[PDB]
mmCIF file with all atom_site columns, C-alpha atoms and ligand atoms in Angstrom:
data_model
loop_
_atom_site.group_PDB
_atom_site.id
_atom_site.type_symbol
_atom_site.label_atom_id
_atom_site.label_alt_id
_atom_site.label_comp_id
_atom_site.label_asym_id
_atom_site.label_entity_id
_atom_site.label_seq_id
_atom_site.pdbx_PDB_ins_code
_atom_site.Cartn_x
_atom_site.Cartn_y
_atom_site.Cartn_z
_atom_site.occupancy
_atom_site.B_iso_or_equiv
_atom_site.pdbx_formal_charge
_atom_site.auth_seq_id
_atom_site.auth_comp_id
_atom_site.auth_asym_id
_atom_site.auth_atom_id
_atom_site.pdbx_PDB_model_num
ATOM   1  C  CA  . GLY T 1 1  ? 42.927 273.266 7.479  1.00 20.85 ? 1   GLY T CA  1
ATOM   2  C  CA  . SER T 1 2  ? 45.137 270.191 7.756  1.00 21.95 ? 2   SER T CA  1
ATOM   3  C  CA  . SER T 1 3  ? 46.641 270.533 4.279  1.00 23.69 ? 3   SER T CA  1
ATOM   4  C  CA  . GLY T 1 4  ? 50.232 270.972 3.145  1.00 21.16 ? 4   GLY T CA  1
ATOM   5  C  CA  . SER T 1 5  ? 51.840 267.532 3.190  1.00 21.23 ? 5   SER T CA  1
ATOM   6  C  CA  . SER T 1 6  ? 54.084 265.346 1.035  1.00 23.38 ? 6   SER T CA  1
ATOM   7  C  CA  . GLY T 1 7  ? 51.840 262.543 -0.185 1.00 24.49 ? 7   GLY T CA  1
ATOM   8  C  CA  . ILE T 1 8  ? 49.734 260.149 1.873  1.00 25.11 ? 8   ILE T CA  1
ATOM   9  C  CA  . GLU T 1 9  ? 50.716 259.087 5.390  1.00 23.62 ? 9   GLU T CA  1
ATOM   10 C  CA  . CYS T 1 10 ? 50.546 255.726 7.166  1.00 22.88 ? 10  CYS T CA  1
ATOM   11 C  CA  . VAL T 1 11 ? 47.319 255.453 9.162  1.00 21.73 ? 11  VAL T CA  1
ATOM   12 C  CA  . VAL T 1 12 ? 49.284 253.087 11.400 1.00 19.17 ? 12  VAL T CA  1
ATOM   13 C  CA  . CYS T 1 13 ? 52.556 254.878 12.139 1.00 24.39 ? 13  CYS T CA  1
ATOM   14 C  CA  . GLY T 1 14 ? 52.068 257.975 10.006 1.00 25.25 ? 14  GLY T CA  1
ATOM   15 C  CA  . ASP T 1 15 ? 55.012 257.165 7.751  1.00 22.88 ? 15  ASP T CA  1
ATOM   16 C  CA  . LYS T 1 16 ? 54.498 258.366 4.178  1.00 20.39 ? 16  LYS T CA  1
ATOM   17 C  CA  . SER T 1 17 ? 52.121 255.677 2.915  1.00 15.21 ? 17  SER T CA  1
ATOM   18 C  CA  . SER T 1 18 ? 53.471 253.871 -0.148 1.00 17.64 ? 18  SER T CA  1
ATOM   19 C  CA  . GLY T 1 19 ? 49.999 253.824 -1.672 1.00 16.51 ? 19  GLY T CA  1
ATOM   20 C  CA  . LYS T 1 20 ? 46.601 252.321 -0.888 1.00 18.14 ? 20  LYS T CA  1
ATOM   21 C  CA  . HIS T 1 21 ? 47.535 248.889 0.463  1.00 17.39 ? 21  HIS T CA  1
ATOM   22 C  CA  . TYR T 1 22 ? 44.953 246.378 1.685  1.00 18.07 ? 22  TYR T CA  1
ATOM   23 C  CA  . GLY T 1 23 ? 42.279 248.975 0.989  1.00 19.72 ? 23  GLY T CA  1
ATOM   24 C  CA  . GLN T 1 24 ? 43.931 251.511 3.280  1.00 18.39 ? 24  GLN T CA  1
ATOM   25 C  CA  . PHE T 1 25 ? 46.915 253.822 2.816  1.00 19.45 ? 25  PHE T CA  1
ATOM   26 C  CA  . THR T 1 26 ? 49.896 252.383 4.690  1.00 18.98 ? 26  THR T CA  1
ATOM   27 C  CA  . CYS T 1 27 ? 53.681 252.663 4.456  1.00 17.31 ? 27  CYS T CA  1
ATOM   28 C  CA  . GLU T 1 28 ? 56.007 249.856 3.368  1.00 20.42 ? 28  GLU T CA  1
ATOM   29 C  CA  . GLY T 1 29 ? 56.925 249.151 6.978  1.00 19.82 ? 29  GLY T CA  1
ATOM   30 C  CA  . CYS T 1 30 ? 53.386 248.308 8.060  1.00 20.23 ? 30  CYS T CA  1
ATOM   31 C  CA  . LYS T 1 31 ? 52.372 247.079 4.607  1.00 18.09 ? 31  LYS T CA  1
ATOM   32 C  CA  . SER T 1 32 ? 54.539 243.979 5.011  1.00 20.15 ? 32  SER T CA  1
ATOM   33 C  CA  . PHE T 1 33 ? 54.187 243.763 8.792  1.00 19.30 ? 33  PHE T CA  1
ATOM   34 C  CA  . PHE T 1 34 ? 50.443 243.399 8.222  1.00 19.59 ? 34  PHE T CA  1
ATOM   35 C  CA  . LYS T 1 35 ? 50.661 240.648 5.605  1.00 22.46 ? 35  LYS T CA  1
ATOM   36 C  CA  . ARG T 1 36 ? 53.485 238.622 7.150  1.00 24.59 ? 36  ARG T CA  1
ATOM   37 C  CA  . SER T 1 37 ? 51.002 238.298 10.014 1.00 24.08 ? 37  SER T CA  1
ATOM   38 C  CA  . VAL T 1 38 ? 47.722 238.128 8.097  1.00 23.83 ? 38  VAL T CA  1
ATOM   39 C  CA  . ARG T 1 39 ? 48.847 235.771 5.333  1.00 24.21 ? 39  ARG T CA  1
ATOM   40 C  CA  . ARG T 1 40 ? 50.507 233.751 8.095  1.00 23.24 ? 40  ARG T CA  1
ATOM   41 C  CA  . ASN T 1 41 ? 47.477 234.003 10.382 1.00 27.98 ? 41  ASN T CA  1
ATOM   42 C  CA  . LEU T 1 42 ? 49.600 235.054 13.358 1.00 28.75 ? 42  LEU T CA  1
ATOM   43 C  CA  . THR T 1 43 ? 48.358 236.507 16.646 1.00 31.16 ? 43  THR T CA  1
ATOM   44 C  CA  . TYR T 1 44 ? 50.386 238.616 19.074 1.00 30.41 ? 44  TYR T CA  1
ATOM   45 C  CA  . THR T 1 45 ? 49.391 239.256 22.688 1.00 30.07 ? 45  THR T CA  1
ATOM   46 C  CA  . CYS T 1 46 ? 49.926 242.861 23.774 1.00 29.59 ? 46  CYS T CA  1
ATOM   47 C  CA  . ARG T 1 47 ? 51.480 242.511 27.228 1.00 30.70 ? 47  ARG T CA  1
ATOM   48 C  CA  . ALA T 1 48 ? 50.089 246.005 27.794 1.00 34.64 ? 48  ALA T CA  1
ATOM   49 C  CA  . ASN T 1 49 ? 46.580 247.460 27.982 1.00 38.67 ? 49  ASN T CA  1
ATOM   50 C  CA  . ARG T 1 50 ? 46.535 247.517 24.179 1.00 40.47 ? 50  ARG T CA  1
ATOM   51 C  CA  . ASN T 1 51 ? 47.209 251.256 24.393 1.00 39.07 ? 51  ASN T CA  1
ATOM   52 C  CA  . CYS T 1 52 ? 50.753 251.275 23.009 1.00 40.88 ? 52  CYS T CA  1
ATOM   53 C  CA  . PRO T 1 53 ? 51.479 254.385 20.898 1.00 41.83 ? 53  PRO T CA  1
ATOM   54 C  CA  . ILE T 1 54 ? 51.961 253.068 17.363 1.00 45.33 ? 54  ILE T CA  1
ATOM   55 C  CA  . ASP T 1 55 ? 53.830 255.985 15.794 1.00 42.07 ? 55  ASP T CA  1
ATOM   56 C  CA  . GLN T 1 56 ? 56.526 256.281 13.127 1.00 41.19 ? 56  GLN T CA  1
ATOM   57 C  CA  . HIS T 1 57 ? 59.188 258.099 15.148 1.00 40.46 ? 57  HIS T CA  1
ATOM   58 C  CA  . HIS T 1 58 ? 59.490 255.093 17.460 1.00 41.13 ? 58  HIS T CA  1
ATOM   59 C  CA  . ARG T 1 59 ? 61.645 251.970 17.186 1.00 40.11 ? 59  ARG T CA  1
ATOM   60 C  CA  . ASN T 1 60 ? 60.015 248.543 16.918 1.00 39.03 ? 60  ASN T CA  1
ATOM   61 C  CA  . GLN T 1 61 ? 56.751 249.231 18.746 1.00 37.50 ? 61  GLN T CA  1
ATOM   62 C  CA  . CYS T 1 62 ? 54.132 246.822 20.090 1.00 35.47 ? 62  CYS T CA  1
ATOM   63 C  CA  . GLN T 1 63 ? 53.165 243.974 17.762 1.00 36.91 ? 63  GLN T CA  1
ATOM   64 C  CA  . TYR T 1 64 ? 49.536 243.210 18.605 1.00 38.89 ? 64  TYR T CA  1
ATOM   65 C  CA  . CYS T 1 65 ? 48.658 246.909 18.711 1.00 41.86 ? 65  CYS T CA  1
ATOM   66 C  CA  . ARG T 1 66 ? 50.465 247.732 15.467 1.00 40.72 ? 66  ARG T CA  1
ATOM   67 C  CA  . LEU T 1 67 ? 49.017 244.674 13.727 1.00 42.45 ? 67  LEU T CA  1
ATOM   68 C  CA  . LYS T 1 68 ? 45.509 245.294 15.060 1.00 43.08 ? 68  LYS T CA  1
ATOM   69 C  CA  . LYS T 1 69 ? 45.584 248.995 14.185 1.00 45.03 ? 69  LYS T CA  1
ATOM   70 C  CA  . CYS T 1 70 ? 45.446 247.647 10.630 1.00 47.34 ? 70  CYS T CA  1
ATOM   71 C  CA  . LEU T 1 71 ? 42.034 246.012 11.026 1.00 49.51 ? 71  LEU T CA  1
ATOM   72 C  CA  . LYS T 1 72 ? 40.958 249.162 12.865 1.00 51.74 ? 72  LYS T CA  1
ATOM   73 C  CA  . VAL T 1 73 ? 42.045 251.922 10.483 1.00 52.07 ? 73  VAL T CA  1
ATOM   74 C  CA  . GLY T 1 74 ? 40.524 249.960 7.619  1.00 50.46 ? 74  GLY T CA  1
ATOM   75 C  CA  . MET T 1 75 ? 43.177 247.589 6.298  1.00 51.78 ? 75  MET T CA  1
ATOM   76 C  CA  . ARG T 1 76 ? 41.355 244.434 5.207  1.00 54.52 ? 76  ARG T CA  1
ATOM   77 C  CA  . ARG T 1 77 ? 42.771 240.914 5.478  1.00 56.05 ? 77  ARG T CA  1
ATOM   78 C  CA  . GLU T 1 78 ? 40.898 239.512 2.478  1.00 56.13 ? 78  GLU T CA  1
ATOM   79 C  CA  . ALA T 1 79 ? 43.216 241.620 0.320  1.00 59.41 ? 79  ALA T CA  1
ATOM   80 C  CA  . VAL T 1 80 ? 46.353 240.157 1.900  1.00 62.80 ? 80  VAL T CA  1
ATOM   81 C  CA  . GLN T 1 81 ? 45.377 237.006 0.009  1.00 61.69 ? 81  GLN T CA  1
ATOM   82 C  CA  . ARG T 1 82 ? 44.456 237.589 -3.634 1.00 59.93 ? 82  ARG T CA  1
ATOM   83 C  CA  . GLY T 1 83 ? 41.795 235.418 -5.245 1.00 60.00 ? 83  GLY T CA  1
ATOM   84 C  CA  . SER T 1 84 ? 38.868 233.725 -3.518 1.00 61.31 ? 84  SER T CA  1
ATOM   85 C  CA  . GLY T 1 85 ? 38.588 234.646 0.150  1.00 59.81 ? 85  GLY T CA  1
ATOM   86 C  CA  . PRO T 1 86 ? 36.556 232.174 2.235  1.00 58.35 ? 86  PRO T CA  1
ATOM   87 C  CA  . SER T 1 87 ? 35.186 232.851 5.718  1.00 55.87 ? 87  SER T CA  1
ATOM   88 C  CA  . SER T 1 88 ? 35.876 230.703 8.781  1.00 53.71 ? 88  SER T CA  1
ATOM   89 C  CA  . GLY T 1 89 ? 32.933 232.112 10.711 1.00 53.91 ? 89  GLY T CA  1
HETATM 90 ZN ZN1 . ZN  C 2 .  ? 53.535 252.462 8.770  1.00 54.63 ? 101 ZN  C ZN1 1
HETATM 91 ZN ZN1 . ZN  C 2 .  ? 50.195 247.024 22.662 1.00 52.16 ? 102 ZN  C ZN1 1
#
């Protein structure tokens, strides 16, 4: 009985997802935040116990946690880069 909403929500922060991005439904805020890191191959180090609350009603939250949450919820990196997607083991 969890119905009655306005469109899809961001599985990362909850923000109204702007459509299925990277295989998963994520908002525009995380949509870019995920790529900018994926396409760039970045890697943040959560100074915390990787338990930072990645919500929407919260200013710039953790980076590693927020970014990771993507690979957790479902967001796939392969997508970030269209075309052939090789594997570096
Ligand atoms: Zn989001
Ligand atoms: Zn964190």
